[PDB]
C-alpha cells in the first residue's frame, strides 16, 4: 500500500482557493476546521466547522459530516479533496481525519483524497490572516 | 569506476538496525526519509526526516543534512552508510541521494557510502510496520 491521509501545505491550499480547484486535476476541495474552544479569532473562508470533541462523542454528527462531504463530491469532477485542520494539526486535525477515514467504505474512500493542513490554522493566519478573501472573521488582536 | 549509489534491501537494513552496524565492515549507518506530504503514518525508527522538496528548494537545508551526516561519520569507525528512502524509492529517494552526492567534495564522498532503500517505506511497512522496535509512529488505518 501507500497512505490514505497526507499533509497539505497552506501554500497549496491557498493556490487551490485562488484558482477555485486543485491546480493539476482541477478537483473540488473542502476545508473542515475541527477546533472547539480555540476556534474564535478567524477561520478559513468557506470551510466547515465540525469540532473534533463533538465528532468523537456524537455519531450522528460524524455521519452528517460524512454525508455532506459525499454529497459535495457527487456534484463535482473527480475526487473531493477533504482538508482537515485544527490549531496546530498535531492532535485534533489528524484524529478527526482518521475518525472520518474509519467511517468510509472502499467505494467512498476512493471518491476522496484526505489531507491534514500542515501547521493548522496557526500557520495559516501567520501569512493569510489579513486577507478577508481567504480568511473569514480574523481578529488580529487575538494573535498579539 | 563502479557506482557511488546502489539499492539496499529492507531485510539488510533491518539486520543492520538489530546488530547496530553494517554486516561486512561493521560500519555505522543513518536513515534519511525524504518524504514530504506522504510522511504521515509511520517512519523508520531513528531515521532523520529531510523532505526532498525542501532539500531541492533550500540549499541551506541540504547543507545542513550534509554537515550533520559528516559530523556523525567523524564520530564513528569507517564510512557512514547513508540510506535514503521515500515512499516507493523510485523517484525522490534517488533524487535526494544525487543532491547530496553533488554537494560532497572528493574527500567527503570518500567518507560515505550512499544507498537507496529498495521499495521505500511502502515495502518496509508491509513487513516491519507492526514492529515498534524498528518502526515509529505507525498508523495502520492509513495503510488500509
Ligand atoms: Cl458548516
Ligand atoms: N547526481
Swiss-Prot record, chains A, B:
It holds the Pfam family Rhodanese. Residues 25-133 form the Rhodanese domain. One of its GO terms (molecular function) is protein tyrosine phosphatase activity. The keyword Cytoplasm applies. It comes from the Eukaryota. It is found in: Cytoplasm; Nucleus. Protein phosphatase. This is CDC25-like phosphatase YCH1. It comes from Saccharomyces cerevisiae (strain ATCC 204508 / S288c) (Baker's yeast). The gene is YCH1.
